[model samples]
Target: PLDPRIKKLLESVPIGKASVDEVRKIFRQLASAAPKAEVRKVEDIKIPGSETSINARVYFPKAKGPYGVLVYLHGGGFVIGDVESYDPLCRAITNACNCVVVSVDYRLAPEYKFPSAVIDSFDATNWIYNNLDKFDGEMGIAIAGDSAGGNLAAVVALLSKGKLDLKYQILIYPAVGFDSVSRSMIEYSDGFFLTREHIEWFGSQYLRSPADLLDFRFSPIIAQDLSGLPPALIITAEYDPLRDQGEAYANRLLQAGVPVTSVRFNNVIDGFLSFFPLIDQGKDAIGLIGSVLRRTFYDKS
Candidate 1:
């Protein structure tokens, strides 16, 4: 059962009836009420790239200079979400990992369309690599995202191969493909917070045409080669429609000789990352993610 606070959050608004912009506004309000973290700062900054301009919010922990950097992409099916909507969780990540997090406000869909978000994400990643010293350049850099953002993170890893060096890629219940033929998509398409109908709607809004679904930038699971990508941490919720694809991608990466760590959380529904303040499982998941990061990046043994 979800915590009452989370229930209240869901009940407070008529979610399905709300527009994407309205939903983002509600999320911002909720984030303002969330527990504040120590040594956290939010900055509305712009990354230099495409003509449209990309905005991002940087979360810096109270720690001293030169911490590892993690670029976070918020999940909204590529049709919703912004930097403010994900502020609270990014604050938690910054506090837990003792790292600086740059949460991107990438362009949305039905407007910017498919490749737009992908290009912005890739450009933001390159910006991070070149300006690491601005955040006091640590020994490592990582990319993380939930849902659609997770999918983007995976693509960034693949796109960055041989171009920019990154230490890890973390994906949480990522929507890696639009193929509805996947077993989990068929089985867990309903009952979960993210219904297949919702996914289909989101996907339709994201891509300009059906053919765009086959593009590697949009559907990363269809990418030809998974080799030479950064080490990965793929986290999936058992009840998510995206579970199968997330797992499949992990397996594909392993087969392609990339180091991978994959874990499936049972009983917890999808979108758990956003419920950290109201769900024990959410907090526990973050702890597990932090442990993975510490073990993989901080531990010498």
Candidate 2:
């Protein structure tokens, strides 16, 4: 059963299931939204890449000095979503967390494909680390994302552990590649909006080939040697299909001696963070991450 509000909202939206190129009107509606809270400012800049440049939107909040920065990535199953779609969420996080957020528009699939997104994700953080002077961060830097983007952030943390050594990370309902024909996946596969079909479709659009599935960058949950990655906070929806696997990933992180926290939001689905405008849980989630980030920034031990 859906939360009353989520159920109503789901009914209100007209979503069409079709090819990535054919039907993406759901994102069309959410692709751009004005901020509810007043932010310090926002700016767009290009991150020069090996071939194509990456675009990002930066949000600054009116808060304490040496703001804890977030290098954020949006989720659209790696094939969709844009900086615009994530603007509202970034602004919300900036205000709630009192942090500067560089929400990345990384390379999407069927064009850039496979390791392109992975490489660009690392580059985004590297740019953040090298250009700290250009932003509001002073305390530390954190990386974050949702769903596919969450996968990338976690992977980047694993791959860049010592080099980046980020202060913190938050993965919102991340698809950590752990669902092994789980019960929740079968029960919630139909009405939750994040269907198995969508997952397979996204994989189809992003993966270069079948072998890519086992690649650590593509599936960090299966990656060995996750011991030294930065401490993390992983959130999963109680009813989302990805819930089981996401939690499973967190367990592995713990087994690997990583300091990690997990939160399961009840009666919600995947991608709740982006629904900050309407979903009640959105604010709570942002507040939780914000407080944790602030604590992490000041923990000098």
Candidate 3:
């Protein structure tokens, strides 16, 4: 039951044929589809990390001076994607959620290796939390991303639970664990935007430690502790390679007593949340996520 537009994309391209570096080139061409938000202010800045500096784009909506900060991470399986590439979504989030959107450009793989990006993700969150006042933002903030970006958002939530005043987490089609034999991985591994080989390729470039796949720093789904994490809105697509793993993580979070809302878009496939330029459902998903953020940050009892 794929949307005709999404189906057209699947037929137009044959994925999994290129290496990680090669595929990154292709995704670089697919511009963010959502219309840019008309935020009151915008700024591009750099976050200083221990090893390297993280580049980020900040978007301020037309809300009150003090607002929640939405730390956004871009998705490309940890190997590709940059802040400029996510400008459209960042703008959309700023306007839709009535908050400041900080689109982070964490270091990629095939160069930095595992835990490097993990450290960078938390570092950016730390910067945003400490410097929220500069953006007219309050201590309240949310973290969100899609695909690998989603994984980073969840992990950042876990890592910064006690340290940062995080309010909500919006994970869209995240890759929580590397389960090649999972049902969705086997069934929808090909011809659905993300392919089995593509997954494998991303792993090859993203990991340096053989056991990083099982490390809590790498896989949020297998983390020993999920308690005390922010409430999460987990999204999954019907025919995506990572769909099962995403739902599984949501269930795990629930079992750990974390508030979780899991939703599956059966009529669409992966990346719909980030492909608004091409997928009409992308806007619908954006509105839903924005509503959650608004309620979590503004409608608090």
Number of the top TM-score candidate: 3
Candidate 1 lDDT over 64-118, as tens digits, reads: 6567788899987887777887877888888777778888888888688888888
Query: CA lDDT of 250 in candidate 3?
Result: 94
For model 2, residues 1-301, the per-residue Cα lDDT tens digits are 6778888877762223566665455575664553557798889999876656889888988875777779998888888887887877888888878888998889988788988888888898887887887885767789999999999898888878779769877888887763549887888877787887778778887887889988999889889788888889999998788998889888998999889899899989888877776788878999888888878876522
User: 1 or 2: which has the higher lDDT?
Assistant: 2
* Total clashing pairs for each candidate: 0, 0, 1
In order of lDDT, best first, we have 3, 2, 1
Cα lDDT listed for each candidate: 0.80, 0.82, 0.84
Stretches of candidate 3 above 4 Å error? Answer: 13-22
TM-score of 2: 0.93
Q: Residue 243 of model 1: what lDDT?
A: 88
Least well predicted 10-residue stretch by lDDT in candidate 1: 6-15
TM-score of each: 0.91, 0.93, 0.94
Q: Between prediction 1 and prediction 3, which has the larger lDDT? A: 3
Angstrom error at residue 198, model 3? 0.5
Model 3, CA-based lDDT: 0.84
TM-score-best of 1 and 3: 3
Give the top-scoring candidate (lDDT): 3
Candidate 2 residue spans exceeding 4 A from truth:
13-16, 19-22, 31-36, 178-180, 299-301
